[PDB]
Here is the input.
Amino acid sequence: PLDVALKRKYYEEVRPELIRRFGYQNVWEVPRLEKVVINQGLGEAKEDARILEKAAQELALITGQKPAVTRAKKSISNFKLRKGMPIGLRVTLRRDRMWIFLEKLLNVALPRIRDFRGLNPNSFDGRGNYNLGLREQLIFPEITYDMVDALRGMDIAVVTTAETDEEARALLELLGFPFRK
Amino acid sequence: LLLECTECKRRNYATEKNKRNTPNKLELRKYCPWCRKHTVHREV
Amino acid sequence: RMKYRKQQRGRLKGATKGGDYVAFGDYGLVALEPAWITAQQIEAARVAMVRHFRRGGKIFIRIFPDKPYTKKPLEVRMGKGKGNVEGYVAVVKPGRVMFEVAGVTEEQAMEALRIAGHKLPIKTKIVRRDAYDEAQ
Amino acid sequence: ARIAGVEIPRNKRVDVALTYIYGIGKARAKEALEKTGINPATRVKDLTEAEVVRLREYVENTWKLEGELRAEVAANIKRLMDIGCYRGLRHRRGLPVRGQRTRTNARTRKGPRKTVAGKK
Amino acid sequence: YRLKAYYREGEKPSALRRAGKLPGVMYNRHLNRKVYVDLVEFDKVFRQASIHHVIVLELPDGQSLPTLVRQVNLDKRRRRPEHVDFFVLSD
Amino acid sequence: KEGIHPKLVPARIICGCGNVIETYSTKPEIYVEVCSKCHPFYTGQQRFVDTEGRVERF
Amino acid sequence: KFRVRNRIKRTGRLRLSVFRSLKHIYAQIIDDEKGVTLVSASSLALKLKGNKTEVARQVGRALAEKALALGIKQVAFDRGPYKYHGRVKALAEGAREG
RNA sequence: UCCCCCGUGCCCAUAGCGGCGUGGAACCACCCGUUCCCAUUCCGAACACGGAAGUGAAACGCGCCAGCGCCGAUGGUACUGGGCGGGCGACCGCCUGGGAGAGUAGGUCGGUGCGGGGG
RNA sequence: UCGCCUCCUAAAAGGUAACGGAGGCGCCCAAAGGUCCCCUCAGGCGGGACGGAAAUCCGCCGGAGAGCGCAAGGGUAGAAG
Ligand SMILES: [Mg+2]
Ligand SMILES: [Mg+2]
Ligand SMILES: [Mg+2]
Ligand SMILES: [Mg+2]
Ligand SMILES: [Mg+2]
Ligand SMILES: [Mg+2]
Ligand SMILES: [Mg+2]
Ligand SMILES: [Mg+2]
Ligand SMILES: [Mg+2]
Ligand SMILES: [Mg+2]
Ligand SMILES: [Mg+2]
Ligand SMILES: [Mg+2]
Ligand SMILES: [Mg+2]
Ligand SMILES: [Mg+2]
Ligand SMILES: [Mg+2]
Ligand SMILES: [Mg+2]
Ligand SMILES: [Mg+2]
Ligand SMILES: [Mg+2]
Ligand SMILES: [Mg+2]
Ligand SMILES: [Mg+2]
Here is the structure.
């Protein structure tokens, strides 16, 4: 909806906390949140009717948004796919849909990766732009074992309106991301 | 092969060049003929 | 080592970019007449100098053979010859500094660069140091 | 219902269904089912979710398992490959460690027999 | 490093070379005068004091202008300096 | 936001340990295994010389 | 960037260049080969409060009456960032038949 | 009649890039929402519509800066129509008119039209 | 080798030769055609689960070094991609 719980926690605690943290000079100077993209590599276009677009519906039922099949730009013969077409799944989540996806992610999904000592806070590096992978895709609160055939590990990238990495660090760590120290 | 569109049981071969393995097989193109303007013009 | 070459004779005309100064080292052979300096004459003069002042200093060959000198194998005329009889040739115009020796004293440098000029087909000058410069 | 890590058994008896969780074997699955208090012969296709979490509260909190255990096993191995204890060496090249002969045997620590041998 | 130099008034650089003079410019962002400095002394000036030392040009009318020898066009063949221009110092 | 959709109905998320997260997803009734209330936590390894001073002494 | 330039695919004269701001909408007939703007019309600095489809229709009415105020009948639409839509210039009094 | 802003062109980097501060009464943009038109192989991010609660933070405008860039003379060589010689040759020399390229001094973050809106 | 195309030799209009240098064509395409509307490339930097050092994704710097069916030029994103 419009009153996402994580969105409310952002708008009521985190923006004045980052203001009273860094000594900002504008309400829009605080790092906002604008992008959570989910990529699915998925080089699987062999014979014997290898459809494998069930994972598109799987990702759509996770997020709440139907991902697009993205055709490969360059054709390389090392992995045998070629000539553009076959597979790569991308979904891009902006406002309240991104917020309900992060409500499903940060509180329900990561707390669970099979060990999960934390995230990797060397991963921002210069832009806003925190990227993080997922080995096992079914940590999410929708899909257990009896809805798939194989393991479909995606990788998300959340982009902030933060110029450096310290600013997005301080944003996402209070939005609810844990880290490794 | 070099195939010519005929006005439908009529005149006016329209003389295109098809690429027969890639699609052909009732090549259908609206075309302006010599007589009775505009038609369907299936090939050959 | 690259783009297609059995290239033409050109013509060894006027020399301005063909000849500026001595940059590396101290002393320098410098040509006084346009001629084709082969790779064989480059190696011949250089192993004259390095064996003259033995285990010596630096001998910068500022020219480089980059022109396929072509020789027909003693027959009539059907196309270009087979190319590269001794190999490639540095097109050298006069005023060009060909060799520079570095650091080694004047008594070895003047009796080394003279040997290099004796194995080269060009009447040469030998310059000492303190040429064209630019820095403030 | 998954138990630990993600390791979910279905349609099996619970007291060997716990064994598919790494770190729980037959003996711990015998013990810490009636220890919590569950009839240990109820097929997990019908396991009450309150009993699932009353089982899981003993599974995760008591002893270390897949991940925190597995990784300590591997850390014990990397700790054994230190400067050269005799059990960390021969983990370092995969030979066996607790008194196994290797003249003919040891196909489960070696391979795939590389049969490049033989005289004339 | 003082040096005598004269004023070319636009009189034939090849004739100055015939005479043995080294032509040149005296120039900065304040003045621009074609000159000729005599080469038989400019070689002794310039190979002693390079482009890191301040020459001073004494002109036919008094002016003992401080300058840095800025650029020399060598004669490409037939080795000698062919033209000079002097970055005259500013105050 | 087009014709095709996952339709994203409001959804409580119960956990086992008792936390409920009021979120939006497909499949409006959802409960999970572990969420928060697993944050810094259980068994930590006993060190080397600590165990080897536990075992024996002269 | 919005590099669209459905500018320079207009060489026929009397170029009606629009501008759809967040607040107003401006429109102006420019002449080509001698770049002089002939007539123009703002929206909110002319008339009705920010009901932007109807007032973008009304600024077009006012602009076409300004064009027939000096007798210009054949023109050519512009503003490459158009997406010809609810910024409407469905008009009379300009015989472009736009 | 001058600065301010908005569009729109001309010359095409001497006006570009990167800095460094300023702008919000308006204007312009970001924004607040997707019901409304139409939207995106997913996403009202773009496009579009509604709004005006807030902000110049980005973006843009307008100033200073030469760091990169770009422009770059005066000279003078190169080259050369045209002429006349030397050189068995490779090629060079003189006169006559042109006259660069790089370089150096430097110049430089616009200039200018047109129609609106504003003190 | 014989025709055609691209450079170069071709001497800043054109044309210009040799058994001079170096490559291509004897087709293809019912979308690789038309029009309308959008979008920008390669690369490098980082950052990302299998993921090649170049799959896919994100963010900066990227004015053409990418692409245009095919050789080579000419051109070109203010499109011809
Ligand atoms: Mg036939
Ligand atoms: Mg043994
Ligand atoms: Mg326009
Ligand atoms: Mg300009
Ligand atoms: Mg700066
Ligand atoms: Mg300021
Ligand atoms: Mg205001
Ligand atoms: Mg704008
Ligand atoms: Mg700003
Ligand atoms: Mg210049
Ligand atoms: Mg010049
Ligand atoms: Mg500047
Ligand atoms: Mg300026
Ligand atoms: Mg020509
Ligand atoms: Mg096309
Ligand atoms: Mg990465
Ligand atoms: Mg990756
Ligand atoms: Mg290209
Ligand atoms: Mg072909
Ligand atoms: Mg071209």
